[PDB]
Structure formats: structure tokens, C-alpha cells
């Protein structure tokens, strides 16, 4: 698949900095970029630039506010949370985070989250200015199939 769901999800930004000083700039004069300078990085190049060197080039700093000031909020009540305005996806960004990181700490704690969100979703499936709908919209695709199954299954079962 050409992956139209997440090719934009790697289009999002990500703040990290350098370890070396490189004259390769495309961001606009002053072609030497000084080291340890915090730069907004798109996920695609930044994923492999933290790999290619021994010592890689980009200082991968963790955006630990996407670690510590939300691990607490999801370790309390997984019912109505801001899962969305902090990150327009919470799923593949968590996937491609853990591939470089490989730490089972938060890899346990979102595994608690999903079944709890799923526990709402099935038994929410039988049949307002800016922020609110997309709480109800990141869940949409995941169940847009599901209640459309229940919709026809009544319409055969009755007359």
C-alpha cells in the first residue's frame, strides 16, 4: 500500500537539534549551521538521520511532554481525554517512536489504553465549534466500518 493514512503522519514536525556543525542549509543564508541548534524536523528524514553516522548527526531529543505530561493523564481515566489536539494521530506516531527507542515502559501503557477505548466504542455503536468533534473523529474510521455493518444487518432482519 502507498499508505495515504500515514504518509501525511510523517509529514508532521518534530523538534530536535545537532551534534556537528554542517554547511548544508536549506532553511536561509549563513550556510554553516551551528551545532546544538534546535530545529523543527519532518519525521521522514529525521527518522533515518538519527541512524546514519557510529555517532549520528541529529541530536534526538525526546519531546518528553509527549511522554510525561500525558502518561499521567492516560493512567487515570481513558474515557474522555484530549487524545487529539496534542497529536493529530496517536497511533503510528507511537509506532515509529518505539522502533528507534525500544523501551517497554510506555509500550505497556498504551496497550492498556486501546482496549479501554475499544470498550467504549463497541457499546457506543448500536443504533462543537473547533476542538470537540475530533475526539469523536479519530475514533471514526475505526468504527465507521463497524456500525455500518450493524446498520444493514438490521435492514435485512426486518421487513
Amino acid at each position: 500500500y502507498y499508505d495515504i493514512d500515514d504518509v501525511l503522519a510523517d509529514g508532521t514536525e518534530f523538534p530536535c537539534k545537532f551534534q556537528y556543525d554542517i554547511p548544508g542549509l536549506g532553511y536561509n543564508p549563513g550556510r554553516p549551521i551551528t551545532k546544538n541548534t534546535k530545529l523543527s524536523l519532518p519525521l521522514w528524514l529525521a527518522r533515518i538521520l538519527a541512524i546514519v553516522g557510529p555517532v549520528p548527526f541529529v541530536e534526538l531529543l525526546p519531546p518528553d511532554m509527549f511522554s510525561t505530561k500525558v502518561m499521567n493523564a492516560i493512567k487515570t481515566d481513558p474515557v474522555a481525554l484530549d487524545l487529539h489536539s496534542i497529536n493529530s494521530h496517536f497511533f503510528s506516531l507511537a509506532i515509529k517512536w518505539i522502533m528507534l527507542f525500544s523501551e517497554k515502559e510506555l509500550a505497556n501503557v498504551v496497550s492498556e489504553l486501546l482496549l479501554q477505548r475499544a470498550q467504549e466504542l463497541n457499546h457506543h455503536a448500536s443504533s462543537t465549534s473547533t476542538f470537540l468533534l475530533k475526539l469523536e473523529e479519530m475514533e471514526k474510521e475505526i468504527y465507521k466500518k463497524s456500525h455500518e455493518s450493524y446498520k444493514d444487518t438490521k435492514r435485512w432482519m426486518f421487513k
Binding site: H124, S126, T128, F158
Partner: protein, 597 residues
Amino acid sequence: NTEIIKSFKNFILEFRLDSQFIYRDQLRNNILVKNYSLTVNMEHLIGYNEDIYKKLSDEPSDIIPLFETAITQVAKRISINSLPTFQLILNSNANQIPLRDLDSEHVSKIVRLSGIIISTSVLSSRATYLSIMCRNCRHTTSITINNFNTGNTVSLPRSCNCGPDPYIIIHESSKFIDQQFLKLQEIPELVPVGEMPRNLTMTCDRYLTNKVIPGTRVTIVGIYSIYNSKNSGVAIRTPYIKILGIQSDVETVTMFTEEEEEEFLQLSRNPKLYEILTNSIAPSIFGNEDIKKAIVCLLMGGSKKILPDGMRLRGDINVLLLGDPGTAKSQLLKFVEKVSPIAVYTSGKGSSAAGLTASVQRDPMTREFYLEGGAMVLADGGVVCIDEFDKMRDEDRVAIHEAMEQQTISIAKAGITTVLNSRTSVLAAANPIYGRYDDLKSPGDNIDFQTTILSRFDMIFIVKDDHNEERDISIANHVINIHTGNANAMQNQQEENGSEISIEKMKRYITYCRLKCAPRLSPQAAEKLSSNFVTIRKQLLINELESTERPITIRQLEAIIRITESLAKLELSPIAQERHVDEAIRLFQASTMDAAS
């Protein structure tokens, strides 16, 4: 007695029309997402329910909740403890005796009202499940208080072997329901002789509260029971309604069904909307094509930017209509009132322009100064409409200068100083200095001294009086068809059902299309309007050197960009284009020339 209970638990688990098994098929659907509520439907409920109501009419105030104990006992059958009690919602429709027959044969019978709700109180609490302690003997019991005869259905007795009235209300194991005391007002059209309208009071339960905003048409069905307050002659009491269910019309908070939007998308792909509305908006208006297009863009509006800094832009447009008497600027304004979601109509004499926005007064309880009234705070999201902008000089201009252009007032009267929000949209229709002389002299003499209001509004029409001998005779042919014969009421009903749009369809899709899409104009248009303005200012600049003064300043240039954003809300496209924007200036280029001649 009891056993009625057995006549209904053995009745709602099987009532159906032909093989759909509906009430279990919705209660199951209603215990899941938490609402805990019912409705009733048609006739046999009526057919034998009168045979129950011939033993419920005697007191439909205590054995109405004898329904309520039943459905909990069918609820636990669909569970297998955290189980609340339920509520009821009714339906009935034959007519509406407005406010006439209200003491003789209507104590504790089912009534139906049509009114306009005006005033909401703050919430409160009464209990429904308590726990009770005897003082020195320490008895423990629990009493439930379900339906009412306001307070004091039953009291607390003296028997625990401890002393008299030893009973106290703990707050550890208690539930609560909320009441309203919202006030109802008579719809001002049904009983005209010479009278002034009256008013009643009512309460409700929590799973039907906060469902109304002030300024709406509404209908309601409920009881007409009587309380007795001891804060006037013999022992007289007062009337009030105990409501049951508001099967209202629309809200006029964006949840609705899906087949509504299906036709809307099926209509919005046909690209004839801009021309077909101008015939179908006002079925009683001869032409007036430049003015008519200004109204549809006024009703929907643009957007609002809270862009990542401190300040903000104002996403709205505000028009004026000044001209000779007999050019239908008046009766056009009643026409926007019914079609708007929220509309008020205060169009006359300003009505004490300091008391237009805010009022404070002493209080019957605690002698306090709190905020009560306003014409603007009622009218947010929608459109107001006023007139007579010649003979108000007192406070009408000093009250709208702050109310417009930033839409952020704060009252600094004796109590609070709070910046309450406002997102209003104004409209006015004045007279010039008897019309003809302002079109037969130097083009001044419109407002008595100041033009500073005129820079605050962008769109200005200046109509006039021609003498074209073929357009009047059609008009004289027009209005006799609409006065008597009512043949165009049969004609426009004949072009309705495939080509035109009635009034009740226009209202519902405007609130849908505004509250879904969010436009933005394309950067290819940025070269277009910039090249437009520099000669527009120059056309003004060539006029000032000829000793011709007055008014154009830069609010209009940031008003055209809202105008071109307006039809983008109409087409519901997330961009804006060039055939989009060239028709937009074609409305405003026409209104630049009349600003000079």
C-alpha cells in the same frame, strides 16, 4: 392500589406493530449510552391507556410515577448495583388553547401550550433519596420522594423511642435532581383585542433541562397543578405548569440525523444556488437584485481568527439601506427575522440606548446588584435589526461604537466589570433628509455632523425613484396577483416542488452549512485585489483635488475579503477562486460608484 404495575410490566415488553418489537429495541439501545428515558407512541396505549387513564385521570400526579417504578423492574432484566430511576416523556397533538381556559376544567389535566421562552434561572437541587437519623435513639431509615402534589410531599415523623422531631439530613448517601423556574411567555399573535400578555412558571427534570435558549418558538405538554407559597385576601394559591416533554421545533450542539445532509449535498452539487436563491428567498419582492444578494451573505457570515498572537480580526459584515419611502426597505426586514436562526426585532426609537446593552437593579432577595438584561446578549450568533438613524442623537451612537468593531463590552456599573463575549451582526434602515433633496444637492447632509459611524459600516445601498414606463406596469401587474386571488400562492407552490425552496428548508441548511465548513481564500487571489484597490483609491484620489469631500477608508478593503469568503460558505468549498471573486467585486464595484454620484 397496586397491580397496575403488573398491567404495564406485562405491557411494554411486547407492544409492537408488525414484527419490529420496538420498545425493547430502544430501551436496550437506551440503557447503553446513558440517558435513562422513554417516550410513548400511538393509539392502543391511548386505546387501553384511557382505560387506564379512566383510573389515572383522578390523580395523574401520583400514579404517573407508578409507571416509573415498573420500568426499573424491567431494566434489571436487561442488566444480568448502580441503577438510577428513569423519567417519562410524552407526545400528543390536537390543538393549542393558548391562555384562555385556565381555571375551570383544567386543574390537573393534560394541557398543551405554545409559547416563547424568555428567561432562565440558575440551577438548583432537590433530593430524591435520603438517609435519616434519630438523635438519641439512633434509628436509620431511608425515604424516597418521587413526584409532587415544590417541596413537602411527605414529612419526617416523630417515631425512631427517642425525642420529638429528632431527624436530620446527612449528606453522605444522597441523590439529587435539578429544577429550573424558567419563565414562559405567550406567543404575541393569538389573542388581540387590546390586551397585554401574561406569563406562567414551570420546572423540569435533569434529562430534559438546558434544552432551550431564549428567543424561540416552542410547544410543551404537561400538568397544571398548584403550589402554595407563603412568600392578599383569603387563602389563595398560584398556578404553575409541571412539564413533561418538549417536542419542540429546531434549536434555531450540531447533532442531527443523516438524511437531512444527503439532500443538501445532492443540492449543493447542482451549481445554480447563487441565482436560484434570489428568486426563492423573497417570493414577494419585485427584483432588487443588488440588494437581495447582500442579504444571503449577511445571514451566514465568514469566520473568526484567534491566530497565534494576541489580537483578532472581526469576521462579519453589516449593511445599510437608506432611501425614499415606498421602496420596501421596511417590510424586507420582517422577512429576515423568521428565516434567521436567532433574530430579535427592536426596530424603533433606540429604546433607551443605554439600557439596550445592560441593566442592573436592586433585588427582592439580599438587596443585590446583578446583571439581568440586554438586547445584544440575547442576540449572539445571529442578527439584530433597527431603524431611524436620523432622530436618535442621545445615546444610540455612543452605545454602538464599542458594541461594534471589537464586539467586546464590559459594564462598569456598581457591581461587576466583566468582558462578556459578543459575536453579533447588525442591520439598519434609516431615512435621509426627506430623500429627494439629498439626491438633488451637494452629496452631503446625511448624518447631521459625523461620518464616523459611516466608516464603521461597509456596505451601503442608495436606492432611488426612476420613471420607467414598462417596469411600473409589471409592478402594478405584480401586486394585485399577490394581494387578492392569491394565484401566485398557487403558482409559486407549483414551481416549488421541483425548482424553488420554501422557507422551512432554507433555515435548516444555513445552520448546517455554517457549522461545518471553514473556508480560506487562495493566494492566487492576493494579486487580484491588490491590483484592484490602487485605482479604487486613485478614483477617490482624483475626486478630492476637485474640492469634493464627504467616505472610503481601509475597513472596506478588509471587508471585501469577508464578502468573497461568504459565497465560499455557500458553495462549501475549502478554497476560493477567481470566478468566485470577480462576481464579488461586481457587487461592490457597483456600490463604489454610487458612493460618488
